[PDB]
Scaffold this active site. Structure first.
Site, mmCIF file in Angstrom:
data_model
loop_
_atom_site.group_PDB
_atom_site.id
_atom_site.type_symbol
_atom_site.label_atom_id
_atom_site.label_comp_id
_atom_site.label_asym_id
_atom_site.label_seq_id
_atom_site.Cartn_x
_atom_site.Cartn_y
_atom_site.Cartn_z
ATOM 1 N N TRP A 84 -2.128 -21.600 73.094
ATOM 2 C CA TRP A 84 -1.127 -21.950 72.092
ATOM 3 C C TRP A 84 0.133 -22.557 72.695
ATOM 4 O O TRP A 84 1.016 -22.984 71.943
ATOM 5 C CB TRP A 84 -0.740 -20.714 71.264
ATOM 6 C CG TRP A 84 -1.916 -19.950 70.751
ATOM 7 C CD1 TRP A 84 -2.368 -18.742 71.197
ATOM 8 C CD2 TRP A 84 -2.795 -20.340 69.689
ATOM 9 N NE1 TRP A 84 -3.478 -18.359 70.483
ATOM 10 C CE2 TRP A 84 -3.762 -19.323 69.553
ATOM 11 C CE3 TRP A 84 -2.861 -21.452 68.842
ATOM 12 C CZ2 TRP A 84 -4.782 -19.384 68.605
ATOM 13 C CZ3 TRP A 84 -3.878 -21.514 67.907
ATOM 14 C CH2 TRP A 84 -4.822 -20.485 67.793
ATOM 15 N N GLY A 120 4.725 -19.940 63.656
ATOM 16 C CA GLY A 120 5.919 -19.247 63.202
ATOM 17 C C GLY A 120 7.136 -20.115 62.985
ATOM 18 O O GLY A 120 8.256 -19.600 62.981
ATOM 19 N N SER A 201 -1.390 -20.375 59.384
ATOM 20 C CA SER A 201 -0.204 -19.540 59.603
ATOM 21 C C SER A 201 1.007 -20.279 59.046
ATOM 22 O O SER A 201 1.025 -20.570 57.837
ATOM 23 C CB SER A 201 -0.127 -19.166 61.083
ATOM 24 O OG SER A 201 0.747 -18.069 61.291
ATOM 25 N N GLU A 329 -5.926 -9.479 60.715
ATOM 26 C CA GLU A 329 -4.755 -10.347 60.791
ATOM 27 C C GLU A 329 -3.626 -9.730 61.607
ATOM 28 O O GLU A 329 -2.878 -10.456 62.271
ATOM 29 C CB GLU A 329 -4.254 -10.676 59.384
ATOM 30 C CG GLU A 329 -5.137 -11.639 58.612
ATOM 31 C CD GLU A 329 -4.913 -13.083 59.012
ATOM 32 O OE1 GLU A 329 -4.024 -13.344 59.852
ATOM 33 O OE2 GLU A 329 -5.627 -13.962 58.489
ATOM 34 N N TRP A 434 -9.246 -11.684 74.158
ATOM 35 C CA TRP A 434 -8.503 -10.512 73.727
ATOM 36 C C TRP A 434 -9.401 -9.276 73.750
ATOM 37 O O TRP A 434 -10.629 -9.389 73.703
ATOM 38 C CB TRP A 434 -7.935 -10.737 72.327
ATOM 39 C CG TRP A 434 -6.872 -11.788 72.277
ATOM 40 C CD1 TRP A 434 -7.018 -13.082 71.870
ATOM 41 C CD2 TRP A 434 -5.497 -11.639 72.655
ATOM 42 N NE1 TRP A 434 -5.820 -13.747 71.967
ATOM 43 C CE2 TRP A 434 -4.871 -12.885 72.446
ATOM 44 C CE3 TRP A 434 -4.735 -10.574 73.147
ATOM 45 C CZ2 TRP A 434 -3.518 -13.094 72.714
ATOM 46 C CZ3 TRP A 434 -3.394 -10.784 73.412
ATOM 47 C CH2 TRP A 434 -2.799 -12.034 73.194
ATOM 48 N N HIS A 442 -5.779 -13.025 64.441
ATOM 49 C CA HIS A 442 -5.161 -14.164 63.778
ATOM 50 C C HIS A 442 -5.309 -15.427 64.618
ATOM 51 O O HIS A 442 -5.108 -15.413 65.836
ATOM 52 C CB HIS A 442 -3.681 -13.859 63.528
ATOM 53 C CG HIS A 442 -2.930 -14.968 62.862
ATOM 54 N ND1 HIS A 442 -2.726 -15.017 61.501
ATOM 55 C CD2 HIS A 442 -2.313 -16.058 63.376
ATOM 56 C CE1 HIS A 442 -2.026 -16.097 61.201
ATOM 57 N NE2 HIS A 442 -1.763 -16.745 62.321
#
Ligand SMILES: *[C@@H]1O[C@H](CO[C@@H]2O[C@@H](C)[C@@H](O)[C@@H](O)[C@@H]2O)[C@@H](O[C@@H]2O[C@H](CO)[C@@H](O)[C@H](O)[C@H]2NC(C)=O)[C@H](O)[C@H]1NC(C)=O
Ligand SMILES: *[C@@H]1O[C@H](CO[C@@H]2O[C@@H](C)[C@@H](O)[C@@H](O)[C@@H]2O)[C@@H](O[C@@H]2O[C@H](CO)[C@@H](O)[C@H](O)[C@H]2NC(C)=O)[C@H](O)[C@H]1NC(C)=O
Ligand SMILES: CC(=O)N[C@@H]1[C@@H](O)[C@H](O)[C@@H](CO)O[C@H]1O
Lengths: 531, 527
Positions: A84, A120, A201, A329, A434, A442
């Site tokens: 990301w 975000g 998102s 989520e 993860w 998410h």
């Protein structure tokens, strides 16, 4: 000398693209097309100015710079977070968009998918590998567009009422890109009368705000909202709170040496971009997860009222929308501040850590509201079992921030004339880095939507490549017809509340997007916060 | 004459009667006066001990029922008539009854003391379902029952006044308990082994004696069936008690607390009864006009406050509920309900039923109830809404007060045994949708199925004998066992289901629902 398929004329002038190899065939790509004047110097914080015409040929042959943003350093070198992070240099000169089209160029107008990344409202870029549009275009013969938009203070610091920093200019960069698509996508073979926005998102929250803003609504025809909604508690901020965070950011970097808004923004414009990024998280009022400093402002212009109000009072006849969430989520956000959580252990928290995490995951609510949360998410036959507490806190954050805003958005749209399709993404990728307890976190449906498992240099399973091709088909069928079908996928309605599970197995229809929990968040808790 | 049927108590001589049970004879002494008649100037006053008498008091038949409302909802219907007075009403009603084995025991025998329910407005020790003859023969105990003043006669309070102090019905019960201490040995009972048990308002009464030091020395164990002193219906504050008493005076033409009570004492007892239900502040089910008042005397604080601050080491209690506590109360005010139809209500009727089932709460509190008792995948299903409203009313008024009492006592030193009564009697006259309604475990505890003139099955008689053994085991030892019944604890929350099948252990007295009433809703109301 020149390949005619890689030469396109738009309003500003001539462009030159590249021919991309995909597993299934060639694709034409026009990467890094300027659609606005660079928002540098005196144009920092200002709405985007359209790109002025140019002579000669612009090489649209690689992704442009990433808009200046905070770079995540929580798990350095860890793939789950680095994917990301910016894969291009940071720059305020960042308002460029990308167009993928079939090779050769389509002869008849072709439906257009327009991607809006999430992050975000403080991060993200259209250049990340997981947003690679080449597989969707080759597999489903659509035109795909993605744009950068300003994030953080550069896109969403608002001194409301002022002309020097009016706020929501990152949303206006998105709108300018959408206007660019209407004026220019036909030159690439795209059909401007069939444009489908999709985002994830904060990108999904952005898509929803374009639905609720009349000047944007005429620029597209269908919408896809993945793991996000404009009515999320994180997605908008009030005029007063926006001004307070803007003023505190100024104070933290030495401006002024409040006051005149002009003198204030002018002082802010003299500071290096990195200096503002370095102080950004300090303006948040409290110790939270899933809260972001500079987000869209509800100020009467882009949004004439709150997304909640516009949703409940909207006429949505003639609109098809596809919405959904992943299975877990909340888990991703818990390792970013919740007490007792880490990706490197099981995060088996105590009762005390669960109660403390509720205030971090639901910031700024009265003690009474926090007590309602704990009453609801505690199993009173097992009030202190660590595994149940970890899972319950994940549900709190996921329900409150994603699932229930999505569910409210789906129910109200369906009841007020829209055709809604809903999904829950339940496949955990074989390549996911993860830990296992996070489930399907998410953001990890995106790679399947974009067909990333088809990349030869990946080691996804053959089953997952079939799955990816199924999802690309669903998304493109929705873009073409407003209906993902052709086992059937029933529309979502406020009564039956039917959705489908997306995994390696065939479609399975279920009822209720956590209806019991979302009744608390969407029906009761607002009444409690009013008295 | 039979010497077994002649007893001398402190007040004088008594003559009892021999009764038949299928297992043999039993001695009964019915209508023993334990207080001076609370008539004329004595109405609303605390009871005075019965003065000694010469001659032989005839204790062969039940005496009068204290003045009370008579239910007329379903005239002639067995489900309601079994609770109505079966003797003439009178204010001269302070009598008690003693059953003992025949011949009378010569060794001290454990004593059970029954306190009837009836919302503090009704009830009588003479009802057929409270017949002590079966328990006494089967389990060899002494059983005592007393009448206590109900309604305004027992619980009208002008707090601070000496003419209408309040709680005198509770003092009637305590006087009978003192009578037990002084006289039960004359019948063969052991005054050092007294177990209180009661149902509904009787259970609430039992809890209030647990919380009042002058009563605590008069018994040793307690059983609370489908009731608790901390129920939202069981007590009233001083201000509301004064308002209700003043409203009653105005409704009957009256009239200074002295002048108010003096005028009230001029009125025939039935006139007070006729206006009793009309002093309630709102339409409601499961609320009663004249109940114990928290005025610092009998109760020094609210029952909840006393439960949370109490040391209960050395106490054993048996508590429980029936499977469907709320269903019976719904046909007395909830819109859409009746015993003669399926009572398949609409959503609108459900929302309306919530306001009458949870009266005197803010709109926000009512919304919280609706949120918790709605299945948001089936928000409009008639059969589900009927159950949900039954649960609302049963949880709010019985189950969760009982669960709070059990958890707090257990965490603070006492040994609790909890049950849920889950057998629907084959003789039950209420419709099947009511399930196991409130109060229909009593007949099994009292061994009524053993009566040959009734239609209970052979399995139900064995079941009744099982329940009598558990209750008597508890009275003898503080432990119902002799498939083990484990104690209830705040953590494990274990209880047993009582039906024709063997004991089954389960966890949680509706823990999720009672967390809302018990833990959240008080905080909500404080804001
Ligand atoms: C599980 O891990 C968390 C977070 O820990 C960090 O990551 C761990 C994998 C390990 O490398 C720790 O040394 C790291 O500090 C632990 O929570 C932390 O606990 C430490 C020590 O008590 C404390 O100083 C930090 O503030 C805590 N941080 C957070 C975010 O809670 C947690 O104790 C571990 N639980 C176990 C071992 O099961
Ligand atoms: C079920 O019955 C109730 C009550 O109706 C009464 O009892 C019936 C068995 C029958 O004897 C009726 O004549 C009685 O009136 C119904 O609720 C009532 O409905 C009427 C209209 O029909 C209305 O005027 C009353 O106010 C209602 N009273 C209450 C207590 O709600 C209810 O609608 C019936 N439901 C069914 C048919 O399933
Ligand atoms: C509105 C106001 O009074 N504030 C002043 C404004 O008048 C002035 O034009 C500006 C010049 O930079 O500085 C500030």
């Amino acid at each position: 000398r020149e390949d005619a398929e890689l030469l396109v004329t738009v309003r500003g002038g001539r462009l030159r693209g590249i021919r991309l190899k995909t597993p299934g065939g060639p694709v034409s790509a026009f990467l890094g097309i300027p659609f606005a004047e660079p928002p540098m110097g005196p144009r920092r914080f200002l709405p985007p100015e359209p790109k002025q015409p140019w002579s000669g040929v612009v090489d649209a042959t690689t992704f442009q710079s990433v808009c200046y943003q905070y770079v995540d350093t929580l798990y350095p070198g860890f793939e789950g977070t680095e994917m990301w992070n910016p894969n291009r240099e940071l720059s305020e000169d960042c308002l460029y968009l990308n167009v993928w089209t079939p090779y050769p160029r389509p002869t008849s107008p072709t439906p257009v998918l327009v991607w809006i990344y999430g992050g975000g409202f403080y991060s993200g870029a259209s250049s990340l590998d997981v947003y690679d549009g080449r597989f969707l275009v080759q597999a489903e013969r659509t035109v795909l567009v993605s744009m950068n938009y300003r994030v953080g203070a550069f896109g969403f610091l608002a001194l409301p009422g002022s002309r020097e920093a009016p706020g929501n200019v990152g949303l206006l960069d998105q709108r300018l890109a959408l206007q660019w698509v209407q004026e220019n996508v036909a030159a690439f073979g795209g059909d401007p009368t069939s444009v489908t926005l999709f985002g994830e998102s904060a990108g999904a929250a952005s898509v929803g705000m374009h639905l609720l803003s009349p000047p944007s609504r005429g620029l597209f025809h269908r919408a896809v909202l993945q793991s996000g909604a404009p009515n999320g508690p994180w997605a908008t901020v009030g005029m007063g709170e926006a001004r307070r965070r803007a003023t505190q950011l100024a104070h933290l970097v030495g401006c002024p040496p409040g006051g005149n808004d002009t003198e204030l923004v002018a002082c802010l414009r003299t500071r290096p971009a990195q200096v503002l990024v370095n102080h950004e998280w300090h303006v948040l009022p409290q110790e939270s997860v899933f809260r972001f400093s500079f987000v869209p402002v509800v100020d009467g212009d882009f949004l004439s009222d709150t997304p909640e109000a516009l949703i409940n009072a909207g006429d949505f006849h003639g609109l098809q929308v596809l919405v959904g969430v992943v299975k877990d989520e909340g888990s991703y956000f818990l390792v970013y501040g919740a007490p007792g959580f880490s990706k490197d252990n099981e995060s088996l928290i105590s009762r005390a850590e669960f109660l403390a995490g509720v205030r971090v995951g639901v910031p700024q609510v009265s003690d009474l509201a926090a007590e309602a949360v704990v009453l609801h998410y505690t199993d009173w036959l097992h009030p202190e079992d660590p595994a149940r507490l970890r899972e319950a806190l994940s549900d709190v954050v996921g329900d409150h921030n994603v699932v229930c805003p999505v569910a409210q958005l789906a129910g109200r749209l369906a009841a007020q004339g829209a055709r809604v399709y809903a999904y829950v993404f339940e496949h955990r990728a074989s390549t996911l880095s993860w830990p296992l307890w996070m489930g399907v976190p998410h953001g990890y449906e995106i790679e399947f939507i974009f067909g990333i498992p088809l990349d030869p240099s990946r080691n996804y399973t053959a089953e997952e490549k079939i799955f990816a091709q199924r999802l690309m088909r669903y998304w493109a069928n929705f873009a073409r017809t407003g209906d993902p079908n052709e086992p059937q996928w029933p529309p979502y309605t406020a009564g039956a509340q039917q959705y489908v599970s997306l995994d390696l197995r065939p479609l399975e229809v279920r009822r209720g997007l956590r209806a019991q929990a979302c009744a608390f968040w969407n029906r009761f808790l607002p009444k409690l916060l009013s008295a």
